[PDB]
Paper text:
Salt-overly-sensitive 1 (SOS1) is a unique electroneutral Na+/H+ antiporter at the plasma membrane of higher plants and plays a central role in resisting salt stress. SOS1, which is highly conserved in the phylae of the plant kingdom, is identified as the only Na+/H+ transporter that localizes at the plasma membrane and specifically exports Na+ by utilizing the electrochemical proton gradient generated by H+-ATPase6,7. SOS1 forms a homodimer and is composed of a TMD and an intracellular domain. Previous studies have shown that the C-terminus of SOS1 contains an autoinhibitory domain to keep the transporter in a resting state with basal activity.
However, superimposition of SOS1-ClassIV structure to the SOS1-ClassII structure gives rise to RMSDs of 1.5 Å for overall structure, indicating that two different SOS1 structures have been resolved. The structural comparison indicates that the dimerized SOS1-ClassIV harbors a distinct conformation to the 2.8-Å resolution SOS1 that the TMD undergoes significant conformational changes and the intracellular domains are nearly identical, supported by the RMSD values between these two structures are 2.0 Å and 0.7 Å for TMD and CTD, respectively. Taking a close look, the extracellular ends of TM helices from two protomers expand in opposing directions, except that the TM8 and TM9 remain unaltered, while the cytoplasmic ends of TM helices are superimposable. Therefore, we termed the SOS1-ClassIV structure as SOS1expand. Within the hydrophobic central cavity between dimerization domains, we found that the lipid molecules differently interact with the SOS1 in these two conformations. In both structures, four lipid molecules are determined at similar positions proximal to the 2-fold symmetrical axis. However, in the SOS1expand structure, an extra lipid is inserted into space between TM1 and TM3′ helices at the dimerization interface. Meanwhile, the side chain of Y270 on TM8′ is extruded in the SOS1expand structure to accommodate this lipid molecule. In the SOS1expand structure, two extra lipids were determined to be buried in the dimerization interface, leading to extracellular expansion of the TMD. However, the differences in bound lipids did not result in significant conformational changes in the intracellular ends of TM helices and in the intracellular domains.
Residue numbers in the entry:
A (entry chain A), B (entry chain B): 32 to 503, 524 to 934, 958 to 972, 1007 to 1017, 1030 to 1048
The structure:
Amino acid sequence: SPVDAVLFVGMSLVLGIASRHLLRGTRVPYTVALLVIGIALGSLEYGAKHNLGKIGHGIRIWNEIDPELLLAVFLPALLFESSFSMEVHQIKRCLGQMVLLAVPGVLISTACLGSLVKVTFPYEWDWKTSLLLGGLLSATDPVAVVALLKELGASKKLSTIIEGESLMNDGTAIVVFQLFLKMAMGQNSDWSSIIKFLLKVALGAVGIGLAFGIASVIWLKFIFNDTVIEITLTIAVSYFAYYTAQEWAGASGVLTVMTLGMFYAAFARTAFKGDSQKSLHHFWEMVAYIANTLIFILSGVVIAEGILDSDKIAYQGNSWRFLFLLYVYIQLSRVVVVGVLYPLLCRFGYGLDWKESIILVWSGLRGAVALALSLSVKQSSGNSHISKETGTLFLFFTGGIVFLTLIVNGSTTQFVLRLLRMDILPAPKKRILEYTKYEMLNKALRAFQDLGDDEELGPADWPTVESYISSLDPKSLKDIRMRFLNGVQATYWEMLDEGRISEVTANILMQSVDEALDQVSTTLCDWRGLKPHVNFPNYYNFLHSKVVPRKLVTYFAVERLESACYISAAFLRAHTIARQQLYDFLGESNIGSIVINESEKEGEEAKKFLEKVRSSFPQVLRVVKTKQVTYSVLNHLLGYIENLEKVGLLEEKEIAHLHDAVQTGLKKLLRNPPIVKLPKLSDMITSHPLSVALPPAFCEPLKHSKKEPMKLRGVTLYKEGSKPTGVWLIFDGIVKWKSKILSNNHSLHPTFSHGSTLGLYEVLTGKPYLCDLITDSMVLCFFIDSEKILSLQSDSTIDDFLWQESALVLLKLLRPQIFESVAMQELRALVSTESSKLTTYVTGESIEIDCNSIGLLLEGFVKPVGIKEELISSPAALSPSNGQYIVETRARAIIFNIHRGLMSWPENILSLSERAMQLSIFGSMVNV
Amino acid sequence: SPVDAVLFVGMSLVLGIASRHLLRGTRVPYTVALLVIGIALGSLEYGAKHNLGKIGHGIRIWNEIDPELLLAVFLPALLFESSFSMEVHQIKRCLGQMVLLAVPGVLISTACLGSLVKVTFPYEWDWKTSLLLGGLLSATDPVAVVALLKELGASKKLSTIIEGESLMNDGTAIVVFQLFLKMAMGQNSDWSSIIKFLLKVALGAVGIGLAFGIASVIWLKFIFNDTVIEITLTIAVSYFAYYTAQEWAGASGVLTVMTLGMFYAAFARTAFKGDSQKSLHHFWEMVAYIANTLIFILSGVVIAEGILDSDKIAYQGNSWRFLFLLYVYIQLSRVVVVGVLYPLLCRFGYGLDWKESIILVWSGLRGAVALALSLSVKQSSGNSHISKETGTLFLFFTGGIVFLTLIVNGSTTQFVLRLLRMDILPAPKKRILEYTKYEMLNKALRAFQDLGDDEELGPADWPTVESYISSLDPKSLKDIRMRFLNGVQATYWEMLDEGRISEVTANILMQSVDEALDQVSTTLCDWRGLKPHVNFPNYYNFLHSKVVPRKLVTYFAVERLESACYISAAFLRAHTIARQQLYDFLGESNIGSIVINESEKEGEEAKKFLEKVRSSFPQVLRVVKTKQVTYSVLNHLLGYIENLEKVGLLEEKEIAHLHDAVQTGLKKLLRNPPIVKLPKLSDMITSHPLSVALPPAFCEPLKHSKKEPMKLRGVTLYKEGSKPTGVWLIFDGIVKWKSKILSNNHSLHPTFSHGSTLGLYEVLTGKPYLCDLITDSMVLCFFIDSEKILSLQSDSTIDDFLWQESALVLLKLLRPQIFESVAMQELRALVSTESSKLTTYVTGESIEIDCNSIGLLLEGFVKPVGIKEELISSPAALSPSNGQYIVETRARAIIFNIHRGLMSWPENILSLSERAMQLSIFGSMVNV
C-alpha cells in the first residue's frame, strides 16, 4: 500500500508537468486543468466504480489523509517561497497599504462573507462554522496572482500591492481559519480565551520564526563558500521552526514558516551566496510547485469522491445554485472590502485610483491555500461539531470557487485590462522598449560581424539567424525633461554595469525614475521616489550613551545609513553626469538651461542628507565607500574566476582555492562592514599626492598637529584678486570655484575633488588669486604657507612637478568645456605622460601646438600669428586655432596630447563600397 | 510515532550541516564525523539504556527500517547526481580503462576478497555469503573520492579515471550484491538461472533507463522556457524509471536510475536550459547530500545498536582483530586488482604509470553505498539463510572499513602525495597560475581606478581592499614552444570569450593543450589530444541507401561531425593566430621559424579532415557555421536580457516576452540543427560583394548556369606573368598565393578568404598576373571574362568601386606585414571610409601621405624625394618614409588612414608625477 501512495504522487506530478507545459500563455492556468483532471479521476474511481488498479489504491490511500498531516506536509511548502522571493524594498515602500489590505481587509471580508452565507444559505448552519467558511475562502493564492500580474499589465504599483496583500492574506486567513476551526473542543469559549489563543498562535509563532531566522542568518554569515549546505540549512531550519512552533510551543507552524520566509526575504539577501541564491529560489519554487500540483489533484479527487457519495450531493441538482451564489458573494465581499479600505488606502503608500481599485478587486484568486484548508475541513469531520455533509459542502464549495475564480477571474481580467486604458504602453516607456529592442539588433549585427572573419567553416547564413531573432523637440519642455530622465536612467545603468551600486540599489533607483517618468509634464519628481529610502531621524547615539564603545557606533550608523548613502551618492553622480550630457546635447537652449536649473535645485535635499551624515558621522562615508569599492572588486574577481572555471584553464585545486578566497572575502564583507581606522592629519598628508614634493623633514611638524582639518559648509578659502597667501590641500570634501574674470562659460559643474592642491598656480607665479573658492560640503582641508612652497621651488625636479600640478589645476579652470566632464583621475595620466613635457621658452621662440595636441602657458606673454596681435596673459590655455604663438616675454609653458545613447535614441543613429560591405557580410539587403 | 522519524531526520540533517561546515579542508571528511556521532548516539540509546525521549523514539523507529525501503529511498538518491555531473567527453576519452577498472576490476576484487574472508575468517561462513560480503564492500564512494581528488593533486588523468571507475563500481557492486544476496530464496540455483537473472537485472534495467531517458530528453527538447518544470520532470522520470524497473519488470531500480543519470550526463547537456543546469545540479547535489548524511547517521546508530546487543559483539574483544584483517584485505585486494589490470590499463586510454598506479590503489574510499548495502544485509536477517550475528558482523565490519578507509586512506593520501613528486607544480602550469594571479591584481587595480573618480562619498581606503584580496629564452627551443602553446591557450580563451565555441569545446581544447604542454621538450603534440574527437570513419550514407530523403543525410552528418567540426575550426584558427603572434614576438629568430614550421606541418591532418568533410558533405560546413553563429548571437542576447532583468529597466511583461523568445530560439537551435537550403550559383553571385557592380541584366545568363562552382584541392587559378584572361570570385573555400617577384617576406599565412574578387587589379590595369594562386581547399569559384569587366569600367562610380576592391586586394598582397594579420572584414571598412579617397594624379603632382595615413599607387610611376630617384612600378604600397613622392606618368592612386599577454607574461610588463598619481589614487606605496 505505501507504493500506491507514491505512485499517485508521481502520476500527479507528471500530470502537473504536462498541464503547465501545455498551458503556458493560454490565458488559463494549469492549476484549473489539474483540478478538472483530479475531479475526473475521482469520478472514474468512485462515481463509476471502475477498478483503476494500483492508481485506484493510491486514490483510496490518499483519500484518508490526516488533516493535520495534510497541513504539515503542504501548507509550509506552499507558503515558504511565496514569502521568500519578495522584493522587500518595494514592500517597505508600501507596507501601510499592505497591512491595511491584509489584517483588517481579511477581517472585514470574513465578517461580511460569514454574515451573507449565514443569513441566506439554507443548511441549518452555525455562526462559528459560517465564519470558519469565510476565513477559509478569504485566502488568496499568491503564486497564481503573481503569474497573472506578470502576464497582466501593472507597471510596479498593482504588482507588488496585490502580491504582498495576497501573501499576507494567506497567513491572516490561516490564523483565523485555525481559530474558527478550533470551536469548542474544550477551549476557545470566552472572549479572554480567544484573545489569549490569538496572542499565542500569532505572536509566539512570529517570535519563534524570527528567532530561528536570526540563528540561521548568523549561521549563513558564518558559512563562507558552499552552495548546497545553504539550501540544506534552509530546509533543516524550516523543519525545526515548524516542529518547535507546533509540537513544542503549540503555536501555528505554518505561520512560523511564513514568518521565517519573511525574515529570509528581508534580512538574508546578503547572507546567501551570490551564485547560490538563484539555485535556492529555483529549488524552493520547485517544492512549492510540487506541493501546489499535488494539493490541486488531491482536492479534485476528494471533491469527486465527496459529491458523488451515497447521499449524492452533486446529483441533488441544487448545490450549484448555492455555489454560484457563493461566487457572487466572493465578488461582493471583495468589492465591499476594497470600497471600505479605499478612503485610507489612497492616503497611504502608493496612490490607488478607481482603475487600480477595480483591478485589485477583480484580481482575487482563491487557489491552493483555500483548497488545502477545505480538505482539512473535509477530513476528521462527521463528529458532533462538524457534521458530514457540512464537511463536503465546504470542500465542493471551495473547489467550485477555485474553479470559477481561476477561470473567469483569470481570463476576463485581461479583457478588462483591454478597457480602462491600461494595456496601452506610454510613450516614455515605449521609447525605452523600442531602444532596448534596437540594441538587440545592433548587438546581434556586431556579433555576426565578428563571426564572419574565419574561413575554414565558410560563410554563415544570415536569413536563418534573422529568423531566430524574428522577435525584433527642442522647444517642448516635456520632451527635454523626458530625454534628461532617460539620460539619468542610462547613467544608472552604466554605473551599475561598472559597479557603483549593487543590484538592489540599482533596482530602487530605476523604479524611482520609472515612477518619475509618469510626471514628466510637471517638475522632475525623481527624488520623491527615493524619499522613503533616505532617512536621518535622530542621532541619540552621540548623547554619550553609546559612544563609550566608540566602535559599535560606526557599526550601527553604517548598518542604518548604508543603503541611503549609496542611494544619495548614485543620485548625485547620475544627475551630474546627465546634466553634463544634456548640456552637450543641447548646447545653449533656454529650455535646456531651465531643466538643468530644475534638476540642480531638485537634487538639493540629497546633498543636505549627505552633509548631515558627514557632520554627524565623519567616518561613515569612508567606510561606505570602502565597502562599495571592495564589493565591486570582489564581484569582478568572481566573474574572472567563473570565466576561468568555465575554461578549465587552471587545475581544479588552485582555481578552487581562488574561488574560496573570493567567496570568503565576500562573506567577510557582507557579514561585518569594513573596519577602517580614523585617519590622522599626517596620514592624509602622506596620502595626498603633493607629499612627494614635501620632504620627510617637513612631514613631521609634530606630525602636522595644532590644526583641525575640518571646515564647515560655505567657509571661504581665498577671495579673488587677493595676494597668494598660501596653497590649500583637499583631502576629502567639496570646493566650488567662481570667477567673473575667468571664462566660466559652459562651466556647468565647477568643482575640485579630493587629493588636489588649490592655489598653487598663484603662489608659484605671484599672480592674484584667479578663482573664488567656496566649500559646498564639509571639507577636510589643510593650509601650508607660501614660504614653504617657495623654498621647495629650489630644486628643478620639484619645481617641474609643482608646475605640472599647477597645469592640471589650470586645465580644470581655464577649459571646463572639455576637461570639466572628466574626473581628476585621467588628467593626472594626461599630465604625467612623457609626451606631455614642461618647457622653458625664450623671447622670440614659439609654442609648437599641432594636430592632436593642446598647450598651456603658465607665465609670460605670447603673440599670435594670423590674428591681430593680442597680449594673452599668463593663464592662456593655448589651443590650435586651425586644427604660430610666438613668445615675447620670459615665458614657461607646458604641452599635452589629447548605454549613453538612450538620452538621444532616434536622433543619434549609399556608397557603392557600403553595399559591397553589406553583401560581403550579410545576405541580400539588410540595413546595419 | 511518525513525527519521531521526521525529528530524527531533521536532527541528522542539522548534524550533517554542522559537520560539513566545521570540517572544510581539515584533511578529514564530514562523513566519518557523522558516522562517529551516529555510533555515539546509538550507544547512548542502547548501550547505556539512557532514555533520550523523542529522539530515542526516532532512533527506535528508524532501527526497524525495511531493507527494500532503505534501498528505494537512499541508493538512487546517492547515485543519480554521482552519475549526473559527469564530463562525458573526458569519460569517452578514457572509456576503455573505465570499463576495465569497473567490470573485471570489481569481479576480481570480489573474488579475491571472498576467497580471503572465507579461508581465514572463522565464523563457519558460507561461500555465497562471503562473496556477498566481497561484492558489498567492493563499492567505492563516488562523492568522497571526487572531493578528495579535487583536494588532491591530479591534473586531469587520475581525477576522471578514479571518478568514473568509482561511479561504475557502484553499479557493478550493487548488481553483484543483489545477485549474491538473492541466494536460494526459490531461485538462482543453477548456472543458467544466474545467467538469465544477470541478463534481466542488468540489460533490462539499462534498457528501461535508456528508454525513459530518451522520452524525457524529447520532452526537454520540447520544453522551451521554464526552469522549474525541468527539475520536476527529472524527479518524476527518475521515480517512474525506478517504478517500472523494479515493480513492473523486476529489474534493479537503482541500476536503472544510475543509467538514467548516465544518459542525462551524456545526451542531455543541450536539452537543459543554459541557466537551469546550475540550479538542477545544485538541487541534486543537495538530495545526494541529505541522502549521504542520513545514511551515514543511520548506519552509525544501527552499528551501535548491533555491536552492543545482548550477545555483546563489540565487548567480545576480538571483532576488531578481524576488522583490521579485513582492512588489510581491502588494501591487498586493491593492490592485486590494480596489478592484474596494469598490463592492459597502460596500453589503453590514458597512460598509467606506477605513480598513478599507487595513487589509484590508495584512493579507494568505501562510503555511503557500502554502508547502505550493509544496512540492507543487517535487516530482514536472522532467518535460515542469513543468520543474526552473520548480519551485524557484516554491518560492523563494513562500518569499520568505512571508518578506517575514510580516516587513513583519506588523510595519508595527501602525505603520499607529498612524496613521489606530484604535489610539485610544473613550470608550464606555474606560469599559467602566476599569470592568472597577476590579472587578478590588474583587474582589481583598474576597478579601484574607476571607483575613485566620485567625490560625494570621499576617498576609498586601499589597505582594506588589499587585505580582502590578500590571496595574491630566445635560444632555447623548449621555452619558445611553451610560449607558442601559451599563445594558443590565450587564443582559445579569447575565441571562447567572443564566442567561437561553446563551453564544452573550449574545455576539450584547453585540456588537450594542457596535456600537450607536458611534452614541450619534444615535437608539439597538441593535435594528439584532439585525435579521439575528430573521426571520419565511413560515408555509407552516400551509397544511395539513405540519400533518397536527401534531408536526413544532413541531419545525421551534422549530428555526428558537429563537435569535430568546431574542434578542427578552432584548432586551425588558434594556430594561425598564434603563429602570427609568435612571428611578431620573435621577428626573425631561427628557432621561431623552426617552431612555426613545426606547427604548420603538425596542423595538417585537421585540414585533411575538414577537406574530407567538405568533399563528402558540401552543405554541412555552412550549417555548422550557421549553428555556431546563431548560438553565439543568442548567448549575447541572453546576456543582455539578463542584464536588463537585473536592472529592472523594462516592465516584467516585455522583458519576459524577450526572454521567452530568446529561450525559444536557443531550444529550437539545440533541438534541430538549422536548416539551410543549398545555395545555387546565382545565390552566391548575388551574395558576393562584387555583384553591386554587376548589372541585373548580367545577373541572369540563365541565372549563371552551365558552370559548376566546385574546384578541387590544388587546382591552379592563373600563373604568374600570364595575361589577365579574367577575374575569379571566391564564394567559399581557400586560395593560397605565391610570388617570388612580390615582397612575400614576412607573409606568414598568405591566404584570401570568401567573398573576394581575385585578379581584378591585373585585368583593370593590363599588367601581368602578380600572384600565383593555388586552392588549398575545395573552393566554390566562378570565372568571368575580361571583356565583361572592361565593359563595366564604362561608368565612373563602377570604375571607382572596382579600383577600391583592387586596392583592398593589393593591400592584402603588397603589405602582409601589417594587413595579413587581419581578416577581410575590417579592410572593407578601411577602404569604404570617406576619408579614404580615390584620386587621379597628373604628371608633376604628388601624393599627400602624412602621419596616421597610408597610400597606394595602382597605375603610373612615382619619383621619391630625398632618396635616389627610383622608378617605382604600378604596385607600390606607398608609405611615409619618415613617419614627397611626386608623380611622373599618367597615374591614379588611393589613400587610406590607419588575454593576449599569456604568450609573453614576464617580458610584456619613477617620475615625480607618477608618484603623485600613485598617492592620489592608492595608499602610501603600491606598484601598479
